[PDB]
Amino acid sequence: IIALFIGIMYFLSTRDNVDELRKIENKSSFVSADNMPEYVKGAFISMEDERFYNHHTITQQVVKNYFYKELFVAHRVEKQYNKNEILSFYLNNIYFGDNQYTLEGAANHYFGTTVNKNSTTMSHITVLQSAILASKVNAPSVYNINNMSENFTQRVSTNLEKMKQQNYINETQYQQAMSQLN
């Protein structure tokens, strides 16, 4: 029956076609990972899925958020998509507060900044702001960017420490963040 429960769960898994993730690209504020500064992707990876590039957690997060056994869907996203694709789906379909489900809509909305390194038309997103938007995605619901508590600040302090530990930012970048943050 634990064989027979693995398989029936797998049938249900296949209802959910993984080609559908492609439609996240069609959104007006979409921005791919390929166009995001190193350290913005780092904010995200270092907090949720340290080893996102080497594994085969972000891919499961992607699945839960678009459709909802999530493991089976997850396997399949990995056969069909490169890592930067998967990462873009993540970042363009998650709750950042105040009705923002894209990284860029979030960033534009709280901060007047952009997450697209190629832009010359709007101010670029700061490491601190990156850490803030990263900290929120799986933060408790009360955690609010428009008025950060000390609990929330703690979570972003920790986001930041992780960025610096996994080398997405340097000592300058990091004490500059910790300073704007206090």
Dist CA 108 CA 101 (whole Å): 12
Q: Which of 78, 77, 103 is nearest to 91 (CA)?
A: 103
Cβ atoms of 84 and 55 closer than 8 Å: no
Dist CA 71 CA 51 (whole Å): 17
Cβ atoms of 126 and 112 closer than 8 Å: no
In CATH terms, the fold of domain 1-182 is Penicillin binding protein transpeptidase fold (1.10.3810)
Dist CA 115 CA 61 (whole Å): 21
Dist CA 96 CA 103 (whole Å): 8
Q: What is the resolution of this structure in A?
A: 2.6
Cβ atoms of 81 and 52 closer than 8 Å: no
Write down the experimental method used for this entry.
X-ray
Total residues belonging to the chain:
182
Task: Give the type of residue at 38.
Answer: E
Cβ atoms of 47 and 111 closer than 8 Å: no
Residue 45 is encoded by which pair of tokens? 């990876």
**What is the DSSP annotation of the chain?**
-HHHHHHHHHHHHHHS-SGGGGGGTTSTT---GGGS-HHHHHHHHHHH-TTTTT---HHHHHHHHHH--HHHHHHHHHHH--HHHHHHHHHTSS--STT--SHHHHHHHHHS-BS-TT-SSS-BPPHHHHHHHHHHTTS-TT--GGG--HHHHHHHHHHHHHHHHTTSS-HHHHHHHHHHH-
Task: Give the type of residue at 174.
Answer: Y
Q: How many Cβ atoms are within 10 Å of 141's Cβ, its own excluded? A: 7
Cβ atoms of 175 and 55 closer than 8 Å: no
Domain segments of the chain as ranges = 1-182
Cβ atoms of 133 and 18 closer than 8 Å: no
